[PDB]
Amino acid sequence: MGFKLRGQVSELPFERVYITAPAGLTIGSDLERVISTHTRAKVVNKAEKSEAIIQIVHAIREKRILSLSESGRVREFELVYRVAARLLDAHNAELASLQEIRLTRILPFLDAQELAKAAEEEMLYKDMQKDAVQQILRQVSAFTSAGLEHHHHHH
Template identity: 45%
Template sequence: MKKILLIVLCSFCVACGFQLRGSTSIPFKSIYISALEGQPIVTELKRTIQNSGKTLVLDKSQDAEATLQITNARITKHIWSISGSGRVREFQLRYQVSYRIIDIKGLEIAPTSVVTLTRIMPFADAQVLAKEGEERMLASEMYRDAAWQIIQRLSKAQPQ
């Protein structure tokens, strides 16, 4: 009975198109990532691209087949909800990354695009230190998610 149930569940998963998120290949042999110093997403992008194993991340733009330019990346924090007594109950964290892809000649392969991610973070005055740690963790998660989305979009780019 358990085997039949397992087979039926697997059949449903296959029929709906479910598949595990695997590595994504980028249509470039080499890429350079251009961004302002200290942008956390650069580390995530490099790690994700290098883990794919097919594309080299180079330190110089003149040697790269394509350049991924991070034109803007910022995280903001806004009050999302307030209690009846006027205290903050939740914050919204928003991470927004603008990027474009250019080839070795400086021609645009993919125009400027924006990835926007948001997370809602409950807040309690009594747990300020814990909430700071949670905020750092959510920000780190957003950097990873944004890098993954950019890589997914990069995989669809057509080299010229």
């Protein structure tokens, strides 16, 4: 019969995985570590011995104005992090075009609070980068079950 328990923490069936980044981004280093620690998978340096391939298209974190006071004063700054990727076969065959990750953090603009200004742009950044990589992890581990459940992708 086989019983359905939970001995795994964040693990998946396909152990051998290969990563490919277009311009070699920071997220590439985070991903390998997050995978090896949370999942049963183990990242290879070459696709000769991989069961699946994780590909990233773009990952840019920029910042722009969100709200204004007095029709001129900067209130909050929208920290927009655009992540787009794909989930391919061991031979780079696109079976699952992975969806988009929507991450926007709220940067409170303050002149006197220099401490806060040296805090938010790290706290909101590290939390957001960590979230994004944990999201990809959660999507890859979900795709082995279904994955298409989150539906929306870039258009």
